[PDB]
Amino acid sequence: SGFRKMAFPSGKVEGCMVQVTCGTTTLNGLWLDDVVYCPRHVICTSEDMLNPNYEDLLIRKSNHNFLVQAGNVQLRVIGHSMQNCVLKLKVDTANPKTPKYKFVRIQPGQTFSVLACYNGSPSGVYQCAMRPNFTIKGSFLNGSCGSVGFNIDYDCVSFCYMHHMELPTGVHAGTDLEGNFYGPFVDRQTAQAAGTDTTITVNVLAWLYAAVINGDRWFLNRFTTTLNDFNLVAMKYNYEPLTQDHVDILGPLSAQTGIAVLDMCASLKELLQNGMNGRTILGSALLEDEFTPFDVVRQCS
Amino acid sequence: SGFRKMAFPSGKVEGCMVQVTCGTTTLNGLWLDDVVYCPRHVICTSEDMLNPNYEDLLIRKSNHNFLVQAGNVQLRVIGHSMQNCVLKLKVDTANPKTPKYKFVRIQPGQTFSVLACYNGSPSGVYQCAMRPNFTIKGSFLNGSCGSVGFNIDYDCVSFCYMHHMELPTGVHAGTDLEGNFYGPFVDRQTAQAAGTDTTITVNVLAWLYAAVINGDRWFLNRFTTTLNDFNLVAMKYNYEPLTQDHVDILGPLSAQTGIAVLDMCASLKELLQNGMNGRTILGSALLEDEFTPFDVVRQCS
Ligand SMILES: *CC(=O)N1CCN(c2nc(NC)nc(N[C@@H](CCO)c3ccccc3Cl)n2)C[C@H]1C(=O)NCCC(N)=O
Ligand SMILES: *CC(=O)N1CCN(c2nc(NC)nc(N[C@@H](CCO)c3ccccc3Cl)n2)C[C@H]1C(=O)NCCC(N)=O
Predict the structure, then answer these.
(1) Residue A162 sits in which domain range?
(2) Where is this cross-link: Glycyl lysine isopeptide (Lys-Gly) (interchain with G-Cter in ubiquitin) (chains A, B)?
(3) Per DSSP, what are the bridge partners of residue A68?
(4) d(CA B121, ligand 2 centre) in Å
(5) Of the residues B50, B71, B99, which one is the last residue of a structural domain?
(6) How many domains does chain B have?
(7) Is the domain of A23 the same as that of A38?
């Protein structure tokens, strides 16, 4: 019983966090086997933030310009290279704490855990979702760059996010672990701003199933809807279209609760049109969209 | 920027989780130095749940009736003893991953991280608060007993909670690590139920300061209030009394934002009396009370 924003246990990722310093710039890196990954803007000088040519900046560096510290131990850099917007620092020691891992890029609407770090030291763990506009609503302060996002499945860490910047609205942008940005953001000074966002409909429906599994039933009704008629309502309320694949993915939660997916859609339509009339679902007075169907199944009975 | 329900990194606690089996009952234990701690109801037989005499149940046991597994390694039990509602199983191996730790009992209104576990294997981490009625609104399934709650300060884990049961409303009850229950709950079959709860006023005020630090200002006003006049409003809305100590504890957040505590109280009074008129604070449409002043300071700029 209960339903919380739950992250994956962070220990396997804690043992990978290091501090990378270049000049007077310090941020976090990720140490896997004998490579340390970090945002390439660690080599950016405050003099040309407008259009850094990173190829130029990096050719002017040697290995000894990179200070890597794992706890109280300094790691000798023996190679450096750029991959898209990430730097790869080869070190002379393989991390003995390297978990089984993968680099996976996630979709908008999928969730992951973030281990926020400062000066290579982990400070907290929380759950986040990739928004439809490829930002994340994180919690990060200055120096958090290089903190990572990840999911864990049977002892294997799938890294999906490395933090690079805060946008003007206070939301966050970064890359996958191959250095490729999520969304149109760039690691150079621009008035870049998050494009218009939408609500993740399949996740709101998953969360309504969580609520029914946990005994919140007040929002149910005897009605059904067609997919097409529901999607006309979704569009009006800035919700993403619900696809037949989404309906199929919600199949197990449907079967467990005995509520057809299009019957739940009729409830969501009524909540969008009427509001909640001062009631709450799973302790929230708004419709929550940062739990996937997988998240609900993992957490709920 | 941003404000999330953030837990402490869980690695130091993951390395302490083990599985304890007695008969056909399995739950989690906590392995620190050469002792494993777990709920004593692991020795309860389904035949007398009504008034188990645990002293009797334990005298009838030997060391070999306790199976302790740390990962894939079985730990030899060499001593067993009861302390209040916890069992202490002495094993022949000190946990090499034991962190610096303390056993601390927390107050209602204080927060902590929970590492939910099943069969000695960690599954997720989340943040929780001790409610004024000494329950916690956790997320736990069958077999979660023995999962712990904790805070971390400069490499030292202060354990404050061990999970023992779900109450009929779906909230959770357990003990400190000395085996003493939080609240009036008992590890025997009763219609025990959570007593009436209240909202943690000092934490709501801390969270309004977080919102101002993060640029949500719409709820501020030019008014002030006296402490006595605010507390008359608090009582009406089932909020805890605000003490002068609470006002003092909010001093740093007051100073950083330039908003006097009693000025923020005037805003909270207006939010209680008027509602939010369809607006949100820090992504919530209700007043959040599970962030302490310390939590806000740790997370915010
Ligand atoms: C992750 C982290 O700890 N960061 C983000 C990067 N960094 C920073 N500082 C400043 N000060 C002027 N400016 C930037 N500008 C961004 C572009 C935004 O358009 C930039 C510019 C050049 C190269 C790379 C980048 Cl990301 N970046 C310090 C620090 C931080 O959190 N800064 C807050 C603002 C931000 N845009 O991240
Ligand atoms: C933590 C955990 O994994 N638990 C909780 C304890 N346990 C359980 N099962 C059952 N089945 C009938 N009953 C109880 N009763 C509680 C008292 C509630 O009044 C009890 C009775 C005797 C001794 C100790 C206790 Cl806690 N407990 C299984 C399992 C679980 O989560 N059960 C759900 C219900 C509950 N009360 O925890």
Answers:
(1) 1-14+100-197
(2) 5, 90
(3) A20, A75
(4) 20
(5) B99
(6) 3
(7) yes
Q: Are residues A49 and A91 in the same domain?
A: yes
B188 lines ligand 2 (CB under 6 A): yes
Chain A residues with beta carbon closer than 8 angstroms to that of B138: 2, 4
Q: Considering A197, A219, A241, which residue would you say is the last residue of a domain?
A: A197
How far does CA A96 lie from the centroid of its chain?
26
Residue B275: which of B230, B218, B232, B215 has the closest Cα? B218
Among A142, A165, A175, A181, name the best residue to mutate to test ligand 1's pocket (greatest count of ligand atoms within 8 A of Cβ): A165
CA atoms within 13 Å, Cβ hemisphere of B233: 16
Judged on CB neighbours under 10 Å (0-12, 13-18, 19+), A67 is middle
Q: Do A125 and B125 touch (CB under 8 A)?
A: yes
CB crowding A196-212: b at 16 or more within 10 Å, else e: ebbbbbbbbbbbbbbbb
Helices (H), chain B: 11-14, 54-59, 201-213, 227-236, 244-249, 251-257, 261-274, 293-299
Question: Is B142 near ligand 2, meaning CB less than 6 Å away?
Answer: yes
Determined by which method?
X-ray
Domain with A73 in it: what CATH number? 2.40.10.10
**Of A69, A83, A91, A71, the residue nearest A22 (C-alpha):** A69
Structure tokens at A119: 């000066």
DSSP alpha helix (H) spans, A28-143: 54-59
DSSP secondary structure of A41-72: GGG--TT--SS--HHHHHHT--GGGEEEEETT
Q: Which residue has the tokens 């040309």?
A: A48
Among protein residues, the one with the nearest Cα to ligand 2's atom 33 is: B166
Q: What is the DSSP string of B225-249?
A: --HHHHHHHHHHTTBPPPPHHHHHH
Query: Is the separation of the CB atoms in B131 and B96 below 8 Å?
Result: no
CB-nearest partner of A10 from B11, B123, B137 = B11
Tell whether B140 lies on the interface with A, counting CB pairs under 8 A: yes
Resolution of the experimental structure, in angstroms: 1.6
Residues of B forming the active site: 41, 145
**Closest ligand, as measured to the CA of A38:** 1
Residues A2 and A144 in one domain: yes
A266 phi, psi to nearest 5 deg: -60, -35
Is A294 in CB contact (< 8 Å) with chain B?
no
Restricting to A residues 150-179, those with a Cβ less than 8 Å away from any Cβ of B are 166, 170-172
Residues A2 and A133 in one domain: yes
CA distance A113 to chain B (A): 10
Distance A139 CA to ligand 1 centre (A): 15
Q: How does DSSP classify residue B284?
A: B
The Cβ of residue A290 has, within 10 Å, a number of other Cβ atoms equal to: 21
User: Which chain B residue lies closest to A3 (C-alpha atoms)?
Assistant: B139
Give yes or no: residues A29 and A150 share one domain.
no
User: For position A203, which CATH number holds?
Assistant: 1.10.1840.10
Verify that B298 and B256 share a domain, yes or no: yes
Question: For residue B43, what is the DSSP state?
Answer: G
Which structure tokens are listed for B111? 């927060």
Asked if B76 and B183 sit in the same domain, the reply is no
